[PDB]
Structure 1
Amino acid sequence: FCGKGYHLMSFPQSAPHGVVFLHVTYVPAQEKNFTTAPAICHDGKAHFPREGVFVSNGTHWFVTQRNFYEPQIITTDNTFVSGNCDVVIGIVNNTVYDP
């Protein structure tokens, strides 16, 4: 509705019998492959990201925000626990750090 991409803001400009909108939008770029999982299995419990997504660079698991790569250590502060590991399809084993 307000340009191609994720809309940030817009500027109006007057035109003869018309209006010109300068739509400022955010476009993602320089994407990178990662190995992802729906949940993390730890201590018999399933951990799900509060706002982000589990990614892996090949050996180590992190959680990052969805629209920008910013890897962080999977802790209890950024994950929540629901159920055991027997239900979620594709759950992987990784440690969950406790601050």
Structure 2
Amino acid sequence: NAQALNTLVKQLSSNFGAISSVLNDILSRLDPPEAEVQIDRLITGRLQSLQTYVTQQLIRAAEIRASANLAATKMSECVLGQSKRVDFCGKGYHLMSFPQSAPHGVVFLHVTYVPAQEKNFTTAPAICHDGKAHFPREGVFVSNGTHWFVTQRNFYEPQIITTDNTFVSGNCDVVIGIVNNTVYDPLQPELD
């Protein structure tokens, strides 16, 4: 923006085919019948320069508006609320953000949830208990070698396999990769 304003000023120094770059000299030492000839080329050159500057400004205005609309959209979702869409505001699972004033824009602070310290476990997609295929209501099955557990996909919170946090469907033959294990039921200890 600064150079666009600056480059326009230098255009006044261009003769554009005239003998002088200043209007007063043209009005001074030129015969008025033919003085306009030097003026006419000068105005066209200056007008052409002015035309270019506005066109360049218009192009940048569209780019700024696109960025401005994008900035407003980010504020609409990632500031006024939580952006469920992934990687729209900060790498990682976005939580929220705080806008900050800038001389000609806005700066966000995207608070993101980045997991770390991962461990790999031997798992199965389903569990067979008494011939019934069990699936997890949420999370996935995991096992620290021998004992099996259920934990959410985004954090290691192992829990005992239980009827309440699992649902059954079908039989043990239709799904592949199943493992044989026992599903704890909280009612039995209460009943006994």
CA distance in 1, matches of 2:95, 2:176: 36
Dislocated runs of 4+, deviation >6 Å = none
In structure 2, the partner of 1:16 is 103
CA distance in 1, matches of 2:171, 2:126: 10
CA distance in 1, matches of 2:172, 2:147: 19
Partner-residue secondary structure (3-state), 1:37: coil
Q: Which of 107, 122, 139 lines up with 1:52 in the alignment?
A: 139
Higher fraction of strand: 1
Q: Which runs of 5+ in 1 are unaligned?
A: none
Q: TM-score, normalising length from structure 1? A: 0.97
Instruction: Give CA-to-partner distance per residue, 1:7-36, whole Å, 9 cap, x none.
Output: 001000011101001000000100001111
CA distance in 2, matches of 1:49, 1:7: 26
State the number of aligned residues: 98
Q: Which runs of 5+ in 2 are unaligned?
A: 1-87, 186-192
Instruction: Give CA-to-partner distance per residue, 1:27-73, whole Å, 9 cap, x none.
Output: 01000011111000100000000011000110011100110000000
CA distance in 1, matches of 2:182, 2:108: 49
Q: Among the aligned pairs, what percent are the same residue?
A: 100
CA distance in 1, matches of 2:120, 2:161: 19
Partner-residue secondary structure (3-state), 2:171: coil
Partner-residue secondary structure (3-state), 1:82: strand
TM-align CA RMSD: 0.5
Question: 1 or 2 for the larger relative contact order (CA 8 Å, sep ≥6)?
Answer: 1
User: Which is greater in Rg?
Assistant: 2
CA distance in 2, matches of 1:10, 1:49: 33
